[PDB]
Amino acid sequence: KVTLNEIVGLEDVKEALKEAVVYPSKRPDLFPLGWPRGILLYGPPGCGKTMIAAAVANELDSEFIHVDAASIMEAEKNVAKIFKTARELSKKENKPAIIFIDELDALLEVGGEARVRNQFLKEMDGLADKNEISKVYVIGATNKPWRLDEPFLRRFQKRIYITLPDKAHRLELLKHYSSKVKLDPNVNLEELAELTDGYTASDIRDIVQSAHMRVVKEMFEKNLQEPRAINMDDFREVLKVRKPSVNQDMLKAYAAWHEKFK
Amino acid sequence: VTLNEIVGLEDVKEALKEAVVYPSKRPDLFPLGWPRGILLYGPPGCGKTMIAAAVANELDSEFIHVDAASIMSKWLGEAEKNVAKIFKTARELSKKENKPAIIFIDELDALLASYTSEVGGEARVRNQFLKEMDGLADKNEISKVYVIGATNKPWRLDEPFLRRFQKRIYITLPDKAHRLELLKHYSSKVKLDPNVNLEELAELTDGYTASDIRDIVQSAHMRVVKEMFEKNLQEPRAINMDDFREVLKVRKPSVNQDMLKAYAAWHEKFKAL
Amino acid sequence: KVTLNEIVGLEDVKEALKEAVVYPSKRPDLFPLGWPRGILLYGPPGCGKTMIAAAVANELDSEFIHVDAASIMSKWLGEAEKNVAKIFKTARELSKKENKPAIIFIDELDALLASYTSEVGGEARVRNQFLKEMDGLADKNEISKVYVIGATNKPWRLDEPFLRRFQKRIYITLPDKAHRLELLKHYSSKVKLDPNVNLEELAELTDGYTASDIRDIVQSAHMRVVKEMFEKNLQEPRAINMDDFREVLKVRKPSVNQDMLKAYAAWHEKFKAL
Amino acid sequence: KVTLNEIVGLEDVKEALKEAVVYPSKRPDLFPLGWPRGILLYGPPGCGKTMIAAAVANELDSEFIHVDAASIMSKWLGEAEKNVAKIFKTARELSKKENKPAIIFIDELDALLASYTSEVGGEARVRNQFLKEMDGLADKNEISKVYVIGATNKPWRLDEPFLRRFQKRIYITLPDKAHRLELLKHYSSKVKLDPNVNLEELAELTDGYTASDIRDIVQSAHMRVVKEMFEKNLQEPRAINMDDFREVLKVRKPSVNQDMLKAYAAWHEKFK
Amino acid sequence: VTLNEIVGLEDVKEALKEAVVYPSKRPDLFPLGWPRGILLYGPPGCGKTMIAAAVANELDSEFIHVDAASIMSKAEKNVAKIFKTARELSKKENKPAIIFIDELDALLASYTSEVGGEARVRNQFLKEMDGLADKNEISKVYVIGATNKPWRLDEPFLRRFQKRIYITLPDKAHRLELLKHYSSKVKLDPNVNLEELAELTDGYTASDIRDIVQSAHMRVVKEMFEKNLQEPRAINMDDFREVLKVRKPSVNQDMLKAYAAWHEKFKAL
Amino acid sequence: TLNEIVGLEDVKEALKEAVVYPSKRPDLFPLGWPRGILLYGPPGCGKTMIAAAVANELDSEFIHVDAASIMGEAEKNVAKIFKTARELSKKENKPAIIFIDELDALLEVGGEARVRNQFLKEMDGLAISKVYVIGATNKPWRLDEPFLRRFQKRIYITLPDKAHRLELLKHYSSKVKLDPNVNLEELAELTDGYTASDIRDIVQSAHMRVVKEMFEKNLQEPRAINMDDFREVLKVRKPSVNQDMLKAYAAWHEKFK
């Protein structure tokens, strides 16, 4: 159960994902010059690229063949099977199957490179338009597109920068991660959102979790029945110590690669 | 898809004719011979691949297409087996029927790297290939076969490699008149709506490669399909001129102003022609 | 045999260990955003990161599956994978219906990132198999319960993927004055000490020494006295004096170099995570 | 080659080749401290080092065992040793009782120092086997006679052991004005030239071009004229004019970059 | 070749006794135990190898000698065996065995397969020393490591050698008994007065004393055969004088400051 | 014999010291004597000819091997080279001398260690008696601190002094008709800094000067050689040993005597 509720906002990113995949599914005839089956989600880590890609499969009541490139690194037997089954699972029932690759970086001594990598690279040239069949997509996810190699890179024509979340994005996160921790007024999430400039969505969950943990520590070593109501100065003290997980230089390194490989 | 000019780039075109179509039609006229190695270098997207296809079809000729990426990664140590075969078959397919065959190499840059592990990836496969071109010259006549190499990164290209391509044609970023016929060809079948006047777009798109024209129209048409969805409807909206306007604020030329100066440098200093 | 009543490290280290592991054990419902199963003990060596982790198992009447990363790399063969899956296997299994949480302890966590032969079975094969196991602890059809305490003196070695399957990281700091005292007591244990010694003023003289090189300082002070009995030719050893500690404390310095102290302190601030 | 052709390269190149090889052939007794059998032709590319070395064999009615170092590395995976010994084998053999000295010529000498697969067999195995062969040419009073002319555009690659089995090193320099003239003649050969062309002032206009990119300049000037006939639709080509050379000489520059020129010049002075 | 002060250097010696001869003679007296790893570090030539032999023979003990060079190039199989046999050779007969490692530095480099070089063989060995501690008693076996380059020595390696003895460049009184021991059998001639040599040889290692006398004696044999006698002449003061102009100390003044630094920051005890 | 190289005494007496004495009179060396001997210096000084001189001083066998050549096994040969040298040192106590040209060249699993430690071991073995190993190198940088300690005797074959050069200039004048006015002495001192190798070159190239003449002049006989021949050939030809290699040797020399 994870439709387009969904991630919290992010529209820009989202409509560009629709554009790539939801439309040619709904109406292929409208794309005479075709449309690319390879799609790349690149950005700082924690922004939960894995959850976004799940959202599009469920938008299309579609199968979501998830694989972590770590594990899959023969091993040729598996890489052909992952496509195999996705095409197969795209039955006469034109339900498009979505293959999702976590840590795409990790696909990059004779058998390590090439053997398993070109076998996979080839598979994507195949998705194009061999006697129609059609349907199957590949969403690759990476926090390190530096690793990504100029051949690899051209079997992913659609590349969407999952950006670090803006102030308005954070707010609805801070809401969604407040969800069920009894919050106490005086907290005013809005001023947090803006205090949390530069944090990924991952290390927001952390912030709240560690703030709420603050309160549970009290109940135990105070010996209260119930936790304390979670205060604003909880966030303040936890926000001194916890910093953004994405370093200012990684931020300039992404920004560079982004403009040179749109 | 013959040499009607894929699109009115004349300058480029006549220099390609010069290199290949003439010696085919009339070799006796070239007593000092003529070079079989020919290099298409410039910013990417200008579709060097389509141009080279045009010359084969100008000569009712075979077009042996190969991406240098694959020939490096995709085999093993003995990716030598394939590089000799590519020439093999092109000569063979240049039968008694003096139909000249054209080998086209996408990403020529890629023969100079991509070895990963086992030893060099250099020399073994590269000199085998470099040798093959010395062979095209004039070994017991036979003749006929050409090599069109394509690259967006002639920096990579190495001063030995370079000299088995004596004919070098800068495929330049397309001029206003070129663009127009592209904008036409990529409008082809997207219901366009009057008020659009392609001419003033062609001139608005100064500095874009031919690749990121297809993008601009595709993304403008995508604008109209986005509307149809959740409003519903089976035809989309009629594609407007302010579509192009808003899409043209966000989408910029894919070829960076510094790459433009880097090509221009290498063009003047390495490339006589 | 050694529960987490514990002697001193409250302020920081111990309560931060409780926080991580003892609470979610006693009361999981109180953590709706869950809680991390991977927990990292990083600091200068000698502070006995191994004895601390034992303390939390015995706090939870819990099993303590101890493994040295050295052995799991060198020992076995190519299929040292067989062992790494078994270590988790048995810990889950031994976390029976009896919701007693099992605690895997990894000495020298650094050592999973090198020490092989067939370049390619060395890395990845065994390392990702292990890295994967920890993603598994999270929340696969509940089961729950099992933890991983990794210990290291060299978190520089530690690698940014590895690092993120240990979300709880506790700097086991060089021991404070109050800590030392109860060590100096525990290592005096049975060496006839002689009054005039007053351990308190030692504890404060031994600012900057690890717990390891306290045992050394007393052992070498007591050795001072045995040297006497022999080359003096006395029948008992001498009673161990205070000026023993003084002259042994000139020569023996802290084992943790002032630069390794700045190197920890750096890594600490750039990879904090409570 | 028939007096060893007076192509022009007198002071410097040719006499220095004669010096090395033609004299000890004609009159060994005159060299009591012996004379080196390894001889290196190093310079910018295109100057046709391969044609020069042919000239010396034909000066001595001598055999010219030509081998490209590329091929000898590539073929016969590991046992490309079999060929390298055979090349010398045959050259000594072909230097029969008939004291005709044989000349081995090695194109791209640089290429013996790379281009392999198995770490251990690439270097050493084939390279020392070859290096050893040259120590053999010295004397062991078995045969004498055989020489090795190595050719390279990249003597940087050349390695300080390799280097010392070539004691005679001749910089084949970019061709002088007088040299060019007889090239411009030889490459005019059969392209109907038209008076008004006066090759002499071209030779001096083409200062800094290698011999290779002179063939290019004329070929591309003649191509100028054929382009006319076609798009003009004339029945013959046009007669090749002087302003052809002029407009082709704006665009075509020397193929040897001014920095390569300083890099050779450096290596030249540090390894005479 | 026991000790007793067979070489005449005490400070070093009593600190070696302290470490090893006492716990052998009377373990009960050490309740906090005693370290089995012991490190001999200093300038080269001072013959660390002969010193360590002396303690084995002090204890009628076995002396398992191994050069770390060989164990690297010429390997896990052997490193376990070296300990294996030393424990085994420490039979019910509580005769403590002593493993001696020449060039301890050499366990930290070598190799061929980067990764079997480090760790594989090094940690196997490092583990072995944690084992000597007190696994179900057994006890007895020691490890004397020798090095001229403790810079190489690595802060983990270092801490399985808790006893570290700086074998210092030999003092004037030490040298004398060397000059005696290396005159041993070269017919010396009066006029020579070894005492004033000992003090002339300030700053030389014990190694380059053997050299100085050998090369002085060589002076006299060269005469024989440049002059043509059947035995040597010969042997005299002024030989030493001329040979002492040319031959200098083998231990450079900067190595001297580098040891001295590493010694202070930080030697144990 | 010891004619021999021409006259380098210093070097020579230090070679005698190492090898000729313990051969004639071992009893005089109670602390033994080293069997491994290293000849290190700039190239061309003909280390190979010097080592031949000591074998012939001892009417001794001279097992010559280039480390280039001896580099899948190759272990078979390295054991055989010692084998035969010990064997050839028969009951007849004639000491055999193994000479290794380019010792540097002994330094993927089989390349290092396999053949190298097999060889390193052989020298620990020499410690029967009789057999020696003279290793030669122009690049003792390559030489490795284990290798290096199985060669306890190390003699810097220095760039040849003025008196040395003279008898070379004589020996390489040997048979080229020289012409008075030449006065070799002032050449020897003009040739400060040249190796013995690039003396042979100097004369050979000076004599070649004269043969040039005969040919392009068309004389019957060469011209007589000269003095200003040497002068012009000495402008162009410089020492083959670079001033930096000179400082690099000098460094290694003092740090590894």
Numbering used by the authors:
A (entry chain E): 96 to 168, 174 to 208, 214 to 367
B (entry chain D): 97 to 369
C (entry chain F): 96 to 369
D (entry chain C): 96 to 367
E (entry chain A): 97 to 170, 175 to 369
F (entry chain B): 98 to 168, 173 to 208, 214 to 233, 238 to 367
What do the paper's sentences say?
Vps4 contains an amino-terminal microtubule interacting and trafficking (MIT) domain that interacts with carboxy-terminal peptide motifs termed MIT domain-interacting motif in activated eukaryotic and archaeal ESCRT-III proteins. Here we characterized the oligomeric state of the Vps4 homologue from M. sedula (MsVps4) that belongs to the phylum Crenarchaeota.
The structure of MsVps4ΔMIT was solved by molecular replacement and single-wavelength anomalous diffraction (SAD) techniques, and the model was refined to a resolution of 3.6 Å. The asymmetric unit of the P212121 space group contained one hexameric ring structure composed of the typical large ATPase domain and the small ATPase domain with its C-terminal helix packed against the large domain of the neighbouring protomer. The 13 amino acid linker sequence plus 6 N-terminal residues that form a short β-strand (β′) in mammalian VPS4A and B are disordered in all protomers. The orientation of the large ATPase domain with respect to the small one is the same in all six protomers and their Cα atoms superimpose with a root mean squared deviation of 0.62 Å. Three different protomer–protomer interfaces were identified between molecules A–B, B–C and C–D (interface D–E is the same as A–B; E–F corresponds to B–C and F–A to C–D), which are generated by a 10° and 15° rotation of the large ATPase domains in the different dimers. Each protomer–protomer interface can be split into two interacting surfaces, the conserved hydrophobic (H) interface between the small ATPase domain and the large ATPase domain from the neighbouring protomer, and the variable (V) interface between two large ATPase domains from neighbouring protomers. Superpositioning of the hexamer on itself by stepwise 60° rotations reveals the extensive conformational space that the pseudohexamer can adopt via its V and H interface in the absence of nucleotide.
